[PDB]
């Protein structure tokens, strides 16, 4: 499994979490650890690296709670990319099914 | 849509095509366009570039076939078939994680 694929899989998971709803880093690590039955356990510094890029590209934004803790939210643009990406990957599944069909 | 994602998708179809059976560049362009009902149009020069990478990594190899004429075909190696299995398994696990994220969510509601 190539390095590019584990990065892509990690990205997909984080963005799906925020689509479930706003959340914070320590909450994101816990939720993921228990949904993989302990298999996937993310590192603080890793999430920070990925969030800097996503916030630079306008995909997510952050704000304060109880104003102590820092929350993250999927932006307007962000929701749009989720839909584009899901659509393209759906069409590919049909194409492959059809390559074998005409076969 | 990121470049790496379209790059990954084209990679994915191409390897699936060879998994259907051996093929050559023009047939690969032909076979895909008719299964996409004309929608998808692959570039020759890209395929030339993309097939070099896969052969460098031991994923595909080629041999000579007779058309009449004489054509060059491409074939998926063992290493290729094993990566196909690995790739499918990992992405199955990712789908499970997503399945459980929404369940534990609905469980907190109650």
Residue numbers in the entry:
A (entry chain B): 4 to 70, 75 to 110
B (entry chain A): 4 to 70, 73 to 115
Give passages from the manuscript.
However, RMH has new side chains installed proximal to the pAF residue. While in both crystal structures, the mutated M19 and H93 residues are close to the reactive amino moiety of the pAF residue, the R92 side chain conformer varies significantly. In crystal 2, the side chain points to the back of the pocket in both monomers, whereas in one monomer in crystal 1, it comes near the pAF-amino moiety. We hypothesized that the R92 and H93 side chains introduced in the evolved RMH variant could assist with formation and dehydration of the hemiaminal intermediate by acting as a H-bond donor and proton-shuttle, respectively. We used DFT to locate transition states and intermediates for a reaction pathway where H93 acts as a general-acid residue to promote hemiaminal formation and dehydration. With the participation of both H93 and R92 (i.e., the front-facing conformer), the reaction proceeds preferentially via the (S)-configured hemiaminal, with the highest overall barrier for this reaction sequence being the hemiaminal formation 15.2 kcal/mol above the lowest energy substrate conformer, and the dehydration step proceeding with a barrier of 8.7 kcal/mol. Noncovalent interaction (NCI) analysis on the transition state structures was also conducted for both the forward- and backward-facing R92 conformations in the (S)-configured pathway to identify which NCIs may explain the role of R92 in lowering the transition-state energy.44 This analysis identified a hydrogen-bonding interaction between R92 and the hemiaminal-oxo moiety in the forward-facing conformation, which is not present in the backward-facing pathway. Our previous MD studies of the RMH-variant substrate-free resting state demonstrated that the motion of the two R92 side chains in each monomer is sensitive to mutations, with the cis-forward conformation (i.e., both R92 and R92’ facing toward the respective pAF15 residues) being greatly diminished in improved mutants.
Our group previously produced a promiscuous designer enzyme by incorporating the noncanonical amino acid para-aminophenylalanine at position valine-15 of the Lactococcal multidrug resistance regulatory (LmrR) protein scaffold. In doing so, we enabled the formation of iminium ion intermediates formed by the condensation of aldehydes with the amino moiety of the pAF catalytic residue, thus mimicking known reactivities of small molecule organocatalysts in a protein scaffold. Assessment of the Michaelis–Menten kinetic parameters of these evolved mutants revealed that the mutations that improved one catalytic activity caused a concomitant decrease in the other, i.e., directed evolution produced catalytic specialization. We successfully obtained crystals for both the RGN and RMH mutants, with one crystal diffracting to a maximum resolution of 2.45 Å for the former mutant and two crystals diffracting at 2.55 and 2.24 Å for the latter.
